[PDB]
Design a protein around this ligand. Structure first.
Ligand SMILES: *C[C@@](*)(O)[C@H](CCCNC(N)=[NH2+])NC(=O)[C@H](Cc1ccccc1)NC(=O)[C@H](N)Cc1ccccc1
Ligand SMILES: *[C@@H]1O[C@H](CO)[C@@H](O)[C@H](O)[C@H]1NC(C)=O
Ligand SMILES: *[C@H]1O[C@H](CO)[C@@H](O)[C@H](O)[C@H]1O
Ligand SMILES: *[C@H]1O[C@@H](C)[C@@H](O)[C@@H](O)[C@@H]1O
Ligand SMILES: [Ca+2]
Lengths: 210, 254, 95
């Protein structure tokens, strides 16, 4: 704040799923516009979302350029009257966001069971290689393409009427739990990055039984 | 220039060396063949406004190759609002008795359009500071031109990160911070008046002038640089304005 | 579901999530709804307006580029070339 008319943005938080990264913030603009600026520890700052009355800003295109780097972002405030007001130190009022490293923080969207079939006395559960916003050379990249070998999975399965909760994992992309010869089984999957220290596990993929 | 690197002879062409009777006074910058820009405070004492010498092409004060060019400083102009002994409005526009010769070793730095300085240059992370100042605090001064590549901060961050001092002069809108607060590197005592040249797309512009700092590369502190862009119309007003009697003119400001 | 109302504008796909969506945009679009035109943004505050040196915004008309006191504006409308031997801000040896 440090206000008299122009209020400072606050609560800057990153909303990122499958690298689709959107910075959001407070407060709902009142007689003032915001401009988002982003950079890397040692890079120049790039401005985004010019003079907007929004409380969000999409930064996908900048972050996927190198989801390995750590990005710091900051929002500027300007009275709607003029988009160039001299603060006190002569510069605009702005606030900094928390640091953001796509690779380690963007949560993995809810997985989706691609196509599971029967190979015999067991079930071959499969998960669709999710599509990310990490646009690489005109094309996009699948989670497996991005995290390569850092992405594993978990398979929670209930049986006909069930009685217990079972789990199975495979770093590949194909589960393979051994089932009996009757009792139908259900499959609830969830992408996981065990080497993570925050959003390690995702959300339980919608269920698909028999 | 604490923690720098010797500026390869020729790569700091706008670097001016301001001498007095033969002793180093400060550094300065060539924004034009007869116009040097330095730090106001560098003249708080100057008693012989005649031995005031400006040296370009300079590089190694030890040996004397043939690329140097001396020039008696004709006039020394500082802002009307500068108050000797204080931190604000620390900038000076020097005029040489006679223009220097442009050569591969003597080229001026561009004095950017204010707008440009404000919208673009200001957000280019790094810029080079340079001079023959001290290499450590009470340490010795450089014999070979030293240059440092430092990062700029907006005053809010500068305040948020520096250790609050007893009476740390406010970081007014005529100065900006650049450097590191981890004791690493920074400009120092003999550098005042030196350029803080920013590179933008193949061209270098004068965005800062060495002024003050707590010590030199003191932990939890940055180095304050005079925000050259508050002073552009000012500089260009003077450069056209016809000469004035005295040596130490005190041009009005704004 | 979610991608029902098809929030993703300007041709962007829509890989929604539970209680939310995710717009995949076309190279010239960005935003939660691919709403933003990577084009409609040619202003000096943006990226020096695309100019190599100086930039001037204009009322209801394309921004203009200009060059420094010793340069000249190339044919592309955004580039500057030296019109003199030793132009400011250029390091002769390296050059
Ligand atoms: C004249 C210049 O050579 C020299 C440059 C020092 C640059 N140092 C860093 N760390 N960037 N400047 C000084 O010697 C100034 C002179 C001065 C100017 C205005 C008011 C008082 C003195 N002195 C200092 O920089 C000293 N550290 C003193 C000081 C001044 C203000 C705050 C803290 C210390
Ligand atoms: C220093 O900063 C304070 C804080 O706003 C301001 O009131 C004052 O005018 C500035 N100059 C002085 C008195 O040091
Ligand atoms: C349709 O999709 C959802 C509805 O919940 C919303 O986000 C969009 O704004 C709407 O067009
Ligand atoms: C997502 O994939 C298909 C639907 C293409 O039309 C793309 O342009 C779209 O963004
Ligand atoms: Ca020499």
């Amino acid at each position: 704040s440090g206000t008299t008319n122009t209020v400072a943005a606050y609560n800057l938080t990153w909303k990122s799923t499958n690298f689709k990264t959107i910075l959001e913030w407070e407060p709902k603009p009142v007689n003032q516009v915001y401009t988002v600026q982003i950079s890397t520890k040692s890079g120049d700052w790039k401005s985004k979302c010019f003079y907007t009355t929004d409380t969000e800003c999409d930064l996908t295109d900048e972050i996927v350029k190198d989801v390995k780097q750590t990005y710091l972002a900051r929002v500027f405030s300007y009275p709607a009257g003029n988009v160039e007001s001299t603060g006190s130190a002569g510069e605009p009022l702005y606030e900094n966001s928390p640091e953001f490293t796509p690779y380690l923080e963007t949560n993995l969207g809810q997985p989706t069971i691609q196509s599971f079939e029967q190979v015999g006395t067991k079930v071959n559960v499969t998960v669709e290689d999710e599509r990310t916003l990490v646009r690489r050379n005109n094309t996009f990249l699948s989670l497996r393409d991005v995290f390569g070998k850092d992405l594993i999975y978990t398979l929670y399965y209930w049986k006909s009427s069930s009685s217990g909760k079972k789990t199975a994992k495979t770093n590949t992309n194909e589960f393979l739990i051994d089932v009996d010869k009757g009792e139908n089984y259900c499959f609830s999957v969830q992408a996981v990055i065990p080497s993570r220290t925050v959003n390690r596990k995702s959300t339980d993929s919608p269920v698909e039984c028999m | 220039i604490v923690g720098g690197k010797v500026c390869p002879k020729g790569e700091c062409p706008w670097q001016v060396l301001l001498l007095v009777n033969g002793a180093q006074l400060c550094g300065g910058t060539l924004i034009n063949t007869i116009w040097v820009v330095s730090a106001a405070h560098c003249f708080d004492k100057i008693k012989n406004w005649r031995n005031l010498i400006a040296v370009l092409g300079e590089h190694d004060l030890s040996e004397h190759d043939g690329d140097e060019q001396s020039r008696r400083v004709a006039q020394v102009i500082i802002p009307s609002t500068y108050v000797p002994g204080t931190t604000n409005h620390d900038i000076a526009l020097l005029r040489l008795h006679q223009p220097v010769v442009l050569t591969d070793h003597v080229v001026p730095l561009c004095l950017p359009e204010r707008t440009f300085s404000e919208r673009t240059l200001a957000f280019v992370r790094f810029s080079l500071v340079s001079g023959w100042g001290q290499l450590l605090d009470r340490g010795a001064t450089a014999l070979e031109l030293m240059v440092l590549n430092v990062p700029r901060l907006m005053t809010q961050d500068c305040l948020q990160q520096s250790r609050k001092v007893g009476d740390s002069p406010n970081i007014t809108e005529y100065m900006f911070c650049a450097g590191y607060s981890d004791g690493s590197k920074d400009s120092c005592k003999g550098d005042s008046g030196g350029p803080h040249a920013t590179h933008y797309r193949g061209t270098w512009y004068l965005t800062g002038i060495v002024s003050w700092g707590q010590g030199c590369a003191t932990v939890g502190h940055f180095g304050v640089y005079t925000r050259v862009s508050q002073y552009i119309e000012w500089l260009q007003k003077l450069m056209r304005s016809e000469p004035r009697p005295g040596v130490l003119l005190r041009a009005p400001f704004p | 579901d979610q991608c029902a109302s098809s929030p993703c504008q300007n041709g962007g796909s829509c890989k929604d999530q539970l209680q939310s969506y995710i717009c995949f945009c076309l190279p010239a679009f960005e935003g939660r709804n691919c709403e933003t035109h990577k084009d409609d943004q040619l202003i000096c505050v943006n990226e020096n307006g695309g100019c190599e040196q100086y930039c001037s915004d204009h009322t209801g008309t394309k921004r203009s580029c200009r060059c420094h006191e010793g340069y000249s504006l190339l044919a592309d409308g955004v580039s500057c070339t030296p019109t003199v031997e030793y132009p400011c801000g250029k390091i002769p040896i390296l050059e």
